[PDB]
Curated annotation (Swiss-Prot), chain A:
Tissue: During embryogenesis, expressed in the brain and kidney. Overexpressed in MYC-induced tumors such as Burkitt's lymphoma.
Lineage: Eukaryota, Metazoa, Chordata, Craniata, Vertebrata
EC number: 2.6.1.42
Organism of provenance: Homo sapiens (Human)
BP term (GO), one: branched-chain amino acid biosynthetic process
Cofactor(s) named in the record: pyridoxal 5'-phosphate
Protein name: Branched-chain-amino-acid aminotransferase, cytosolic
Length: 358, 359
């Protein structure tokens, strides 16, 4: 093993810098900044020196294993231009931890998390003017790692590329969910608890079917009893009165088929800290959900992820019926409290160990 | 707007310097590529561009391409064979076009005219025909591949894609030992294990590595509470045995959603049915069915099937700490050899059948 080292960065600035977009009309993942991080690896020579250089197309051998066998993984985190014009990262160490565990499970080569994070900070610092001047926009950071092995054997790659992209993004509009148990996102003994690209390609067909029935996202069901696991690429929370008449924030447990979201983590830590209601990592079925609905026990349902922070759910289509979820008719008080909190930390209105300053 | 590319529109740019062909006896699968490739671009705004045959070159991809982020990708595998009469043949290539088409739909990649793709492939092989080995134990592997090149990071149906085809000469019983650990699952009901989407393969690298450091060559993929035997590496699985009712039987798992429908598998079932010499069954097979059969000396042969190897006999399985011996090689292996001999006779034109296409 070894690692590229940030003290070795080679930097090659763009000649012609691009005009920044309007913060208030930005579609996610659509606009990229001026520069990118690339680092090459080979089993023969190990990790090359890291480059920050102008955003450009990748030159890949058409046999590259990323293209044939989905030898690939990614992350997603954000930079925030704070109320004090200071640029913060949020919980970035948790993303480095996750990206490392993904690399191991993908058989891609390991790296030093601290060195990566310090390369990412130099990238953002170079393009810091792309970090939106706005309190409802951010800069999305997309570390990506791919096998570039030029041979068609299914095997651990002997060549790889780690690269990082920057994209400015903007922004409740509740969501409707499509729940069809014929599709299964992830299985025990599979990779659904890692952020490996192979888990996502198989979802596009279900998403299209979702939009065809006028839903915005897929509710991922699992098992004979139709456990509700995730919502699109978001963790799922239920705020309700449970079977014993207690107020509870519940979310599926990490038993292999749930991606351990940073946002999910932060929300559980906030809820534990507040001490106002029971906080439960536990199994939730559609029948638990509908039984609770025809007893008025449900308050809120929402998804969580880095992109939206929190995403309220208003309806589920299941077995030919639209099932109303009273999230918006209950405020949504919890959802909004969580958003305000996380936003406060992110933009440095509130001071906490969750952010790092550039 | 343009719904399919057409072979009639092919644009050909030959390489200026041709590479030296390898020796067909020292070939490692998928490491040597020929002089030329086929590339066809697509966009949602204009549809399919014209197909190009041009020199093997690196792809220039937007770093946001969805193939790289969300495994919006699929592939195929088929072979060209230089016959005993020196005519070049493809084997069942319309089945590969059909399977690629079905995969594309499940991936949400754009559809294409299957006949047009095959004609472009034929024209690529023709240009590179001297790469088709002068050997009856070697052949030319054809790797059609189809990727999303959508440059935006949203998870969604791609608005840009690339279809490309690589060629790779590949060389020539060497039995395999299998690592069977129920902790890894290849595919599951409600997933995509019945299509050749690249998403299914990247998950398997960890298990394959664990096989190799327990000194096995391949993974035996187990499924479910009862440890169904499903597939071996990237091959379908066959068991030749006396079954529970005491009948000689060739058995292979059914296509219930977790099995890739191999062209080789289909061909072997068709041959077995035509011979009519024993029972042929698409049926569940568990580790307990296997170990019980072995204790009773009822197993004759176990082998994998797939385009690259044709048939790959199994000699041992490591399971729950012990090595379980499979007596394939002590039984000839008669059936495995007869299948290989029949398929290769068809592929290399020793026997004329409509499973092959000349040129």
């Amino acid at each position: 093993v070894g690692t590229f080292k940030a003290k070795d960065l080679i930097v090659t600035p763009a000649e012609i810098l691009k005009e920044k977009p309007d913060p208030n009309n930005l579609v996610f993942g659509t606009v990229f900044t001026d520069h990118m991080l690339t680092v090459e690896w080979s089993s023969e020579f190990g990790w090359e020196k890291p480059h920050i250089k102008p955003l450009q197309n990748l030159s890949l051998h058409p046999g590259s294993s990323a293209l044939h066998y989905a030898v690939e993984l990614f992350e997603g985190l954000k930079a925030f231009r704070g109320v004090d014009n200071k640029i913060r990262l949020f919980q970035p160490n948790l993303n480095m931890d996750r990206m490392y565990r993904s690399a191991v499970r993908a058989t891609l080569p390991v790296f030093d998390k601290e060195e990566l994070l310090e390369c990412i900070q130099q990238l953002v610092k170079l393009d810091q003017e792309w970090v939106p001047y706005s309190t409802s926009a951010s800069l999305y950071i997309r570390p990506t790692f791919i096998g570039t092995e030029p041979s068609l054997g299914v095997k651990k790659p002997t060549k790889a590329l780690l690269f990082v992209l920057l994209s400015p993004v903007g922004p409740f509009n509740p969501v409707s969910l499509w729940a069809n148990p014929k599709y299964v996102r992830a299985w025990k003994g599979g990779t659904g608890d890692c952020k490996m690209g192979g888990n996502y390609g198989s979802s596009l067909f279900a998403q299209c079917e979702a939009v065809d029935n006028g839903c915005q996202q897929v509710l991922w069901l699992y098992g004979e009893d139709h456990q509700i696991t995730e919502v699109g690429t978001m963790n799922l929370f239920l705020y309700w009165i449970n079977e014993d008449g207690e107020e509870e924030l519940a979310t599926p447990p990490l038993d292999g088929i749930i991606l351990p979201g940073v946002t999910r983590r932060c929300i559980l830590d906030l809820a534990h800290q507040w001490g106002e209601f029971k906080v439960s990592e536990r199994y939730l079925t559609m029948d638990d959900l509908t039984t609770a609905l025809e007893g008025n026990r449900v308050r809120e349902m929402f998804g969580s992820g880095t992109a939206c922070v929190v995403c309220p759910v208003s309806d589920i289509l299941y077995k030919g019926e639209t099932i109303h979820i009273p999230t918006m008719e209950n405020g949504p008080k919890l959802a909004s409290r969580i958003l305000s909190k996380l936003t406060d930390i992110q933009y440095g209105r509130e001071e906490r160990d969750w952010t790092i300053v550039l």
